[PDB]
């Protein structure tokens, strides 16, 4: 069953931006309803935990700028696994998240902190979301080769040979 | 970065050869056939080298992660960013291999091994045929 690749997949939510608008405060809230947000990530678990509790270079800059991002670490350091964190922000139109997974290897002999490993690239441009360059290059080259093949077969069709002259047109 | 640098220089020379063959085809008068053959063969073998070198360094290209510059403004250059970002094939090639697969259409595996044995048999047969007659 034909599936559109998620790298080119682009979601638009006019109702959400009309109701709430685009801001770093609710950029994760905007991302929550997208298909790219896995329901198995610990961010959703933290979300239900918060809901239950209520019912009952630029990395350091964005680190020190917002306190909710602080709360994100102090709620995310306890849970290791696939997590969604912000990468960088330039207002009022550009935001990009950092898709990384954490394995808090607390074993004896490792003086390093929890291991952070990239998984995917996500770019929020306007109200749209974008998600390999190797594929782009090979696709461009192969389409170029197809066009070249068509041109060369047409040119060879145009070619006419005679023994007494050689090849002419 | 070294692998992508080599890819850069080789693709740049390939694009230069493409520009060449372009501005010698754009003339209203067609040059001699032989010059066209030389240009075709050179550019096409250069494309082969491009393919081979891109094959060699897939790991370095895959390991790299794309990220826009902090200094690069997206508000004014979002069109330029989207131009390079898009990667979907041209449609005509798409329905091209769709019709190709339509025409082509444990059983598949044993046909695959039957193709293996036909290939090996044909190779051995032509080796024998070449050995039959002295070509030196």
């Amino acid at each position: 069953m034909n599936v559109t690749p998620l790298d080119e997949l682009q979601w638009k939510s006019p109702e959400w931006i009309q109701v709430f608008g685009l801001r770093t405060e609710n950029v994760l809230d905007y991302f929550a309803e997208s298909p790219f947000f896995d329901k198995t990530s610990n961010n959703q678990v933290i979300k239900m935990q918060r809901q239950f509790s209520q019912l009952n270079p630029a990395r350091r800059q964005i680190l020190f700028k917002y306190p909710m991002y602080m709360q994100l670490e102090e709620e995310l350091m306890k849970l290791d696994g696939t997590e969604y964190v912000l990468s960088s922000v330039r207002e009022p139109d550009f935001w990009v998240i950092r898709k990384q997974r954490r394995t808090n290897n607390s074993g004896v002999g490792s003086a390093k902190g929890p291991e952070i490993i990239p998984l995917q690239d996500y770019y929020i441009i306007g109200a749209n979301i974008y998600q390999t360059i190797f594929k782009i290059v090979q696709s461009r080259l192969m389409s170029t080769s197809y066009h070249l093949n068509s041109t060369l077969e047409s040119l060879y069709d145009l070619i006419e040979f005679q023994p007494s002259q050689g090849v002419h047109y | 970065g070294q692998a992508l640098d080599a890819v850069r220089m080789r693709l740049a020379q390939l694009t230069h050869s493409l520009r060449r063959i372009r501005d010698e085809m754009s003339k209203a008068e067609l040059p001699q056939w032989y010059t066209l053959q030389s240009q075709l063969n050179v550019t096409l073998s250069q494309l082969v080298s491009v393919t081979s070198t891109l094959q060699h360094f897939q790991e370095t290209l895959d390991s790299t992660v794309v990220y826009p510059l902090p200094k690069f403004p997206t508000t004014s250059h979002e069109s330029l960013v989207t131009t390079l970002l898009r990667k979907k094939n041209i449609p005509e090639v798409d329905e091209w291999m769709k019709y190709v697969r339509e025409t082509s259409g444990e059983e598949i595996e044993k046909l695959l091994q039957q193709d293996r044995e036909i290939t090996n048999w044909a190779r051995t047969t032509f080796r024998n045929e070449y050995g039959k007659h002295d070509f030196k």
Binding site: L9, Q10, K12, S13, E33, P35 | T15, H16, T83, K88
Partner: peptide
């Protein structure tokens, strides 16, 4: 040095083929 740089071969007129489909909520 550099014998000649490459001519700008930008094609902004290219319409692109981005598939758009997950718009409905």
């Amino acid at each position: 040095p550099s014998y000649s740089p490459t001519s700008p071969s930008y094609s902004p007129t290219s319409p692109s083929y981005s598939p758009t489909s997950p718009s409905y909520s």
